[PDB]
Amino acid sequence: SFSGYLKLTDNVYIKNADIVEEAKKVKPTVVVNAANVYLKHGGGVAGALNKATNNAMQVESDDYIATNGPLKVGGSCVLSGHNLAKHCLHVVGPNVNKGEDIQLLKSAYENFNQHEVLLAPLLSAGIFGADPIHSLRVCVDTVRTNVYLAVFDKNLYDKLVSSF
Ligand SMILES: Cc1ccc(S(=O)(=O)Nc2ccccc2F)cc1C(=O)Nc1cnc2[nH]ncc2c1
DSSP: OOOSOEEOSSSEEEEESOHHHHHHHHOOSEEEEEOOTTOOOOSHHHHHHHHHTTTHHHHHHHHHHHHHOOOOTTOEEEEEOTTTOSEEEEEOOOOGGGTOOTTHHHHHHHGGGGSSEEEEOOTTOGGGOSOHHHHHHHHHHHOOSEEEEEEOOHHHHHHHHHTO
């Protein structure tokens, strides 16, 4: 099971960890990817998860997009978790660097409520450009299922806990 997490609320937990290493250790039922609408896993959490699957996540994702077209900002799809998890929930939070609406962050977190427990990153944080303190607030006020947040950056983890 999950270990070494700090409890923030009844259902939200947080740890300073690399989500790839956490997924390889725990083999959760669901790992969340910080996806874009095209499922092009180039950088950030998506690039790191895809590299850990030896590009199998990108080959499956390209077939999904060829069949279904792009996701919506704030939407998600469930695909294989490959060697990392049973499933990967690809969730698209708004990318502030591309000018997307930050109000869509709550819609993005609502996708997590379809799964009893998830290993996840903070949506729209990092290279997506939003304030991670805001992302954690929307996560706690939106997600009702059990979420284990992995924050890679130690300095950001300490700021997120100390300002919670
Ligand atoms: C800058 C940074 C570096 C590294 C990490 S990470 O390694 O924890 N995660 C991570 C890295 C890449 C892709 C996606 C990820 F989630 C996060 C951040 C972060 O979000 N900081 C931060 C702090 N205050 C801010 N205010 N407004 C914006 C803003 C951003």
